[PDB]
Structures are given as C-alpha cells and as structure tokens.
C-alpha cells in the first residue's frame, strides 16, 4: 500500500514466530525500540498491528520516534514513546519497472501534521491560499497526492523500499499473541526441575497408572498438592514423586 | 550536539552491583562469531548521547 494509505494488518490469536524475522538475512533495517525481538517469544500481547507501506530509500529514516518530514508528518507518524519494531528492505526488483512505476503515491500537502498512527486518505484539493477551491484545481489549489518515481536505474535513496511497522497492544483483554517457546526432551525416573504448560516444580516423573479425562491436565492430591500431570505433547500421564530427602 | 558522553547499548548479561564494564568488544547478536568485525548481528556496543 501507499504511504498515504498504509495498510494495517491485525494479528491476534496465533503463535507469533519472531525467529524467522530477526534471523532472516533479507531485511536491511530491523530496528526495535524499548523491546528486543528475541524477548518477544517470551511475551504475549493482545493484538499486534503490522502497518505496511512503501517509501523511497532516503525516506526510510523518517519511520522512527522523533522524526520529521513529508512522510513523518503527512503520511505516517510514530509516537515519541513507540515500543514496537520497524522493518524495511529494498524492493527495487518488485516496486520498479522500465519507465517508472507511479502506482505508489504520497501525500504532499496537508493543513497540519499527523498524529501517532493516524491515517489520512483524503483527496481534497489543498487550499494553499485564502480563496476556497471548491473542488477545483488551479492557482493555490493543488492535488494533495503525488506519485513516486520508482525506476530500476534510480539511486538507492530514490529506489523503493517496503516497510512494516510492528506495534504491540495490551488492552483489558487476554493476550492471544504468544511466542512458540520451543520445548525440550523429557527425562524420567530422576530428580529434575520440570516446567509444564503453566506450572513448575522439582520432582521425579514416573510412568503412572491414573486415568485422566481428555480435558484434565494436572492432577491434585488431598491437600491441594500436585501429584500428577499430563505431558502437553504426548498424552501420557506422569506421577510426580518429591525428590528424596530427609534428616541427617 | 555533544557526543563525547556514551552509554553501553548491548551486553550478554546485566551488570552486578558496582560492576564496571569498559570493553568495546563487538556484540554477537546472532549465532555467527564476529571476530572483531561489525556487520549483520555484529554491533558496536556503545553509542553516544545527543
């Protein structure tokens, strides 16, 4: 999408795999503010918005907190306390053709600067003077949008670049966007420090003879004590015996 | 802008109390050794204040 009409994809209720991104070698800019891409796998968020748009190379610096310019003011603006990520990579092979691709536009005039995550797709004739334009172009009456000169032979600064801004949200709602948090192998009949889906402990895991129900996950003793669990990956029930101990 | 004052931006672990780290080693953000060479996932640890 164009910078003046940047698209916004909403991500919710899914496993957010950030490894494929920060380890990929196809991204020129992968900036992040107040948050590490690796730590995201350990975090959950209510919603994650990927704002996508194309801008020329030298305008890629405007996508950041405390930035000014055509893109920063009239097309796309970020807050001074942004805590997401900004990713950008060249798209000269995709967003350029012999003759000049003009399908990507940008807002050139506006009566005021944009607000954080504000989208203006209006095509009203800009009134540069005191004479109302009344939807007619002319002197002091210009079209607010203008095309980009994306050609294969253009300079890197003027060549197209695809940009995605990842913003995270935490409402009064459940966090449905979590990381994968890859597991480990399982060891039985030993004192180990185990961490299952939502619980942790220290004990000995043994093949059990109990019969959990299909929806039952972790068992309990009489004194609200965890005695058995169900392995999330393999539907095998494990008894938990406390690690051997006693007075000396 | 005065850029003489710096701050460390990357470190493999948090500092212990009253610890002092003045190293300029290249920070290995990925699995590839940097061998003192900056680049992808190889960043200079310090950065200046504006």
């Amino acid at each position, epitope marked *: 999408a164009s910078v003046y009409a940047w698209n916004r994809k909403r991500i919710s209720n899914c496993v957010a795999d950030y490894s494929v991104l920060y380890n990929s070698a196809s991204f020129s800019t992968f900036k992040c503010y107040g948050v590490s891409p690796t730590k995201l796998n350990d975090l959950c968020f209510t919603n994650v918005y990927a704002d996508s748009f194309v801008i020329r190379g030298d305008e890629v610096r405007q996508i950041a907190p405390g930035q000014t310019g055509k893109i920063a003011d009239y097309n796309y603006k970020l807050p001074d306390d942004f805590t997401g990520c900004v990713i950008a990579w060249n798209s000269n092979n995709l967003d350029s053709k012999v003759g000049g691709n003009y399908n990507y536009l940008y807002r050139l005039f506006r009566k005021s600067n944009l607000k954080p995550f504000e989208r203006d797709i209006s095509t009203e004739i800009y009134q540069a003077g005191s004479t109302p334009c009344n939807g007619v172009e002319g002197f002091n009456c210009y079209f607010p949008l203008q095309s980009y000169g994306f050609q294969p032979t253009n300079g890197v600064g003027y060549q197209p670049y695809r940009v995605v801004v990842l913003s995270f949200e935490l409402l009064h709602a459940p966090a449905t966007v979590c990381g994968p948090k890859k597991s480990t192998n399982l060891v039985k009949n030993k004192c180990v420090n185990f961490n299952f889906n939502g619980l942790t402990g220290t004990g000995v895991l043994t093949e059990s003879n109990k019969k959990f129900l299909p929806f039952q996950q972790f068992g309990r003793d009489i004194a609200d004590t965890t005695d058995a669990v169900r392995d999330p990956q393999t539907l095998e029930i494990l008894d938990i015996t406390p690690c051997s101990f006693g007075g000396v | 802008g005065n*850029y*003489n004052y710096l701050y460390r931006l990357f470190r493999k672990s948090n500092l212990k109390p009253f610890e002092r780290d003045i190293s300029t080693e*290249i920070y290995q953000a990925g699995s590839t050794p940097c061998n003192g060479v*900056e*680049g992808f996932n190889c*960043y200079f640890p310090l950065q*200046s204040y504006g």
Partner: nanobody
Amino acid sequence: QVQLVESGGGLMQAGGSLRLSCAVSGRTFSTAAMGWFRQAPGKEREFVAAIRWSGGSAYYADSVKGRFTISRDKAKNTVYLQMNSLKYEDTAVYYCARTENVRSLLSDYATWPYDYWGQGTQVTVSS
C-alpha cells in the same frame, strides 16, 4: 579547531591504484568515525566509505566494494583510502569527514551527517 587536510590526489591511468591521505589535527579523543565521500562536477556528493575510529570496522558503498579500502592510523590521526582498479567514473573531488557521534550500527555512518569536512582533493582517471 578541528582541521581535516586531504592529499594524494592527482592524475592516474585507468587500472592503477592511488592512496589518498587525510590528516586530522585538533581534537583526537572525540573522533567516532572517519568517512570518505566523493563528488563529480554537476553531480551530488556521494558516500564512498566509512571506518570506525575505534576497532577499525569499515563500511563500503556498493559502487567501490572490492576496489576501495579504507584504513586509519590512530597514532598519526590519519585516514587512508586506497583506491584500486581506478575507473574513469572515479574522477571527482574526494573529501574526508569526521564524526564524533558514536553509533552502534556501522551502516548509520553511510547516511548520518558529519560535523567536520576537509577541503577535498581532485582525482582524475584518464585511461
């Protein structure tokens, strides 16, 4: 005052090599990086190379990768640009700039501004 002085420019035949030198006098400890730019008549000044003063890590423009090499002598407070495989397209005035802004990402020096600039030296590649 911080003074940058370029030298080494001159006439060369295409395919040769030339080492441009740039000496810095005045402030030394505050040097964060040294960059080489070039500008041809009627053309915009363009980034050629950059080198971090500490560590010596270098960042090169794609147009000169494999031909130009940027190095620096801290004891002499000098920065050198060895231009190999000289081309007619290399004919331009080469300037050296100094920055005291330490940036974690080296590539930032390919676009961030420089506060000090030398007078430049002409290089001409005839054939």
